[PDB]
């Protein structure tokens, strides 16, 4: 609530960024694996 | 090897989309944080001002 | 957060205001009392 919820708003905004970073690196090894074989 | 090309192009088209969306999130997350800092300084002004008016009425009280 | 503090403090500002504004009226009433005296 108040600045806490907007902090959570940014917090979950950061987790979405964090999970996006995981998916970005995930696809790098996927294409690397595709480029490997 | 051609099935790989279909798979490689699929993930590559998704990866470039991933790059576009991640940066857009990065773009908005910064702007949200700068506007967050605008809110952070927003109360700091009136918090100083709510308690200066809180004290100014003390003389007008007694 | 802050907004909850912002909302509560402004009410306290308003509530202390309403005491100060009311106190002036009864102080003005005392002034009228001196006028008859």
CSV table of C-alpha atoms in Angstrom, one decimal:
chain,number,residue,atom,x,y,z
A,1,UNK,CA,0.0,0.0,0.0
A,2,UNK,CA,1.0,3.6,-0.8
A,3,UNK,CA,4.8,3.7,-1.4
A,4,UNK,CA,4.9,0.0,-0.4
A,5,UNK,CA,2.7,-1.2,-3.2
A,6,UNK,CA,4.4,1.0,-5.9
A,7,UNK,CA,7.6,-0.5,-4.5
A,8,UNK,CA,6.0,-3.9,-5.1
A,9,UNK,CA,4.9,-2.5,-8.5
A,10,UNK,CA,8.6,-1.8,-9.3
A,11,UNK,CA,9.6,-5.0,-7.5
A,12,UNK,CA,7.4,-7.2,-9.7
A,13,UNK,CA,8.4,-5.0,-12.6
A,14,UNK,CA,12.0,-6.0,-11.7
A,15,UNK,CA,11.1,-9.7,-11.4
A,16,UNK,CA,9.5,-9.6,-14.9
A,17,UNK,CA,12.9,-8.1,-16.0
A,18,UNK,CA,14.7,-10.8,-14.0
A,19,UNK,CA,12.7,-13.6,-15.6
A,20,UNK,CA,13.2,-11.9,-19.0
A,21,UNK,CA,16.9,-11.9,-18.5
A,22,UNK,CA,16.7,-15.7,-17.7
A,23,UNK,CA,14.8,-16.2,-20.9
A,24,UNK,CA,17.3,-14.1,-22.9
A,25,UNK,CA,20.3,-16.2,-21.7
A,26,UNK,CA,18.2,-19.3,-22.1
A,27,UNK,CA,17.7,-18.7,-25.8
A,28,UNK,CA,21.5,-17.9,-26.2
A,29,UNK,CA,22.4,-21.5,-25.3
A,30,UNK,CA,19.4,-22.8,-27.3
A,31,UNK,CA,20.7,-21.1,-30.5
A,32,UNK,CA,24.3,-22.1,-29.5
A,33,UNK,CA,23.1,-25.7,-29.2
A,34,UNK,CA,21.3,-25.3,-32.5
A,35,UNK,CA,24.5,-23.8,-33.9
A,36,UNK,CA,26.5,-26.6,-32.3
A,37,UNK,CA,24.7,-29.5,-34.0
B,1,UNK,CA,19.4,-29.8,-40.7
B,2,UNK,CA,16.5,-28.0,-42.5
B,3,UNK,CA,14.3,-28.7,-39.5
B,4,UNK,CA,17.0,-27.0,-37.4
B,5,UNK,CA,16.8,-23.9,-39.8
B,6,UNK,CA,13.0,-23.8,-39.1
B,7,UNK,CA,13.8,-24.1,-35.4
B,8,UNK,CA,16.7,-21.7,-35.4
B,9,UNK,CA,14.7,-19.1,-37.3
B,10,UNK,CA,11.8,-19.6,-34.9
B,11,UNK,CA,13.9,-18.9,-31.8
B,12,UNK,CA,15.9,-16.2,-33.6
B,13,UNK,CA,12.6,-14.4,-34.5
B,14,UNK,CA,11.6,-14.9,-30.9
B,15,UNK,CA,15.0,-13.8,-29.5
B,16,UNK,CA,15.0,-10.6,-31.4
B,17,UNK,CA,11.4,-10.1,-30.1
B,18,UNK,CA,12.9,-10.9,-26.7
B,19,UNK,CA,15.5,-8.2,-27.2
B,20,UNK,CA,12.9,-5.7,-28.2
B,21,UNK,CA,10.6,-6.4,-25.3
B,22,UNK,CA,13.3,-6.6,-22.7
B,23,UNK,CA,14.7,-3.2,-23.7
B,24,UNK,CA,11.2,-1.7,-23.6
B,25,UNK,CA,10.8,-3.1,-20.1
B,26,UNK,CA,14.2,-1.6,-19.4
B,27,UNK,CA,13.1,1.7,-20.9
B,28,UNK,CA,9.9,1.9,-18.8
B,29,UNK,CA,11.5,0.5,-15.6
B,30,UNK,CA,14.0,3.4,-15.6
B,31,UNK,CA,11.3,6.0,-16.4
B,32,UNK,CA,9.1,4.4,-13.7
B,33,UNK,CA,12.0,4.6,-11.2
B,34,UNK,CA,12.8,8.3,-12.2
B,35,UNK,CA,9.1,9.1,-11.7
B,36,UNK,CA,9.3,7.0,-8.5
B,37,UNK,CA,12.1,9.3,-7.4
B,38,UNK,CA,9.8,12.2,-8.3
B,39,UNK,CA,7.3,10.7,-5.9
B,40,UNK,CA,10.0,10.1,-3.3
B,41,UNK,CA,11.0,13.8,-3.4
B,42,UNK,CA,7.3,14.7,-3.6
B,43,UNK,CA,6.4,13.7,0.0
B,44,UNK,CA,9.7,15.1,1.2
B,45,UNK,CA,8.7,18.6,0.2
B,46,UNK,CA,5.2,18.5,1.9
B,47,UNK,CA,6.4,16.3,4.8
B,48,UNK,CA,8.7,19.3,5.6
B,49,UNK,CA,5.7,21.5,4.8
B,50,UNK,CA,3.0,19.5,6.7
B,51,UNK,CA,5.1,19.7,9.9
B,52,UNK,CA,6.1,23.3,9.4
B,53,UNK,CA,2.4,24.1,9.2
B,54,UNK,CA,1.9,21.7,12.1
B,55,UNK,CA,4.3,23.9,14.1
B,56,UNK,CA,3.0,27.2,12.8
B,57,UNK,CA,-0.4,26.6,14.3
B,58,UNK,CA,1.2,25.9,17.7
B,59,UNK,CA,2.0,29.6,18.1
B,60,UNK,CA,-1.5,30.4,16.7
B,61,UNK,CA,-2.8,28.0,19.4
B,62,UNK,CA,-1.0,29.3,22.4
C,1,UNK,CA,4.2,3.7,2.4
C,2,UNK,CA,4.1,7.4,2.1
C,3,UNK,CA,0.6,8.1,0.7
C,4,UNK,CA,-0.9,6.5,3.8
C,5,UNK,CA,1.3,8.8,5.9
C,6,UNK,CA,0.4,11.7,3.4
C,7,UNK,CA,-3.4,10.9,3.8
C,8,UNK,CA,-3.2,10.6,7.6
C,9,UNK,CA,-0.9,13.6,8.2
C,10,UNK,CA,-3.1,15.9,6.1
C,11,UNK,CA,-6.1,14.9,8.2
C,12,UNK,CA,-4.1,15.6,11.3
C,13,UNK,CA,-3.2,19.0,9.7
C,14,UNK,CA,-6.9,19.5,8.9
C,15,UNK,CA,-8.0,18.3,12.4
C,16,UNK,CA,-5.5,20.5,14.2
C,17,UNK,CA,-6.6,23.3,11.8
C,18,UNK,CA,-10.2,22.8,12.9
C,19,UNK,CA,-9.2,23.1,16.5
C,20,UNK,CA,-7.2,26.3,15.8
C,21,UNK,CA,-10.0,27.8,13.7
C,22,UNK,CA,-12.6,27.0,16.3
C,23,UNK,CA,-10.4,28.3,19.1
C,24,UNK,CA,-10.2,31.7,17.2
C,25,UNK,CA,-14.0,31.9,17.1
C,26,UNK,CA,-14.4,31.4,20.9
C,27,UNK,CA,-11.5,33.8,21.4
C,28,UNK,CA,-13.5,36.2,19.2
C,29,UNK,CA,-16.4,35.5,21.5
C,30,UNK,CA,-14.3,36.6,24.4
C,31,UNK,CA,-13.6,39.8,22.6
C,32,UNK,CA,-17.3,40.4,22.3
C,33,UNK,CA,-17.7,39.7,26.0
C,34,UNK,CA,-15.2,42.5,26.7
C,35,UNK,CA,-17.2,44.8,24.5
C,36,UNK,CA,-20.3,44.5,26.7
C,37,UNK,CA,-18.0,44.8,29.8
